[PDB]
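Course exercise 7: structure representation. Students receive a sequence record and must write out the corresponding structure in token form. The form below is the worked example handed out in class, using Midasin (289 residues). Read each field label carefully; the graders check that inputs and outputs are placed in the correct fields and that the protein name is recorded exactly as given.

STUDENT ID: A-19
EXERCISE PROTEIN: Midasin
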Amino acid sequence: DEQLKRPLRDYGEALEMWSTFQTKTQALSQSLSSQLRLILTPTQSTKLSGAKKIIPYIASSYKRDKIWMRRAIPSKRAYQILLCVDDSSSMSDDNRSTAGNLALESLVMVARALTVLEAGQIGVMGFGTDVFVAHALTDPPFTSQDAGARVLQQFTFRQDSTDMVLLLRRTIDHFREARLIQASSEDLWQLALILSDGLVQSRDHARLRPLLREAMEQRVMVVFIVMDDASVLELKEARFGPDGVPVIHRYLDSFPFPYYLIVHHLEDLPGALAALLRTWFAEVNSGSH
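STUDENT ANSWER:
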């Protein structure tokens, strides 16, 4: 907490960032939210049992189908997503890497998609040497521009190291805290989405294993998104829409084990987050297991 007295970004600047990223990602946020709504909607087909054709008059009103929808998505299941963003200087790289910005832009895309969807809670954590909650799961969803500015303010990408072990334990802790709350008024699905740049040497994989093992016993699912790009001003201009990758086939196949999605091109970052989220929502939702 004492290390947290870093200076924040200028509010006007963070406000303009949020607004710019929202405009740049709105198409993808809207598409993704319509895909997640479809995934959560009961859509199982009818089934055959046992063993002139009658042609009944089958009619309904579109009005009535919107009413069925208002009751259709069950509130017994909630989704909790912690989006964890590397707050170290490796993300800034003296403006050379540009990864920090693309990561915040992806955060905006996800936050807007979950808000429009009106299902799930979003939380945001930053991590480097310390770990801070930039936006708690119990905070109001990102409908207001102030709430978006305030999250982006907290990310300046100047911590000097990345301590993945600490991030994992706090993430586990925060999810445990969240499970206790719902035990006293509720099926709860929890996902940590961890974005960072650089390399992973397997010296890194191994020391994460006990915590990841602990997370799995607590049904927490963990996905690492690893950015490693080897220009900057047209990223500024870039507009994001659907890129044609609905799911991560390999992650679907490994569910619910921890997964590393390696993203070599930063303009794929928002696409890759969208695809991971669709995959996860599809998996936690299927009656499987």
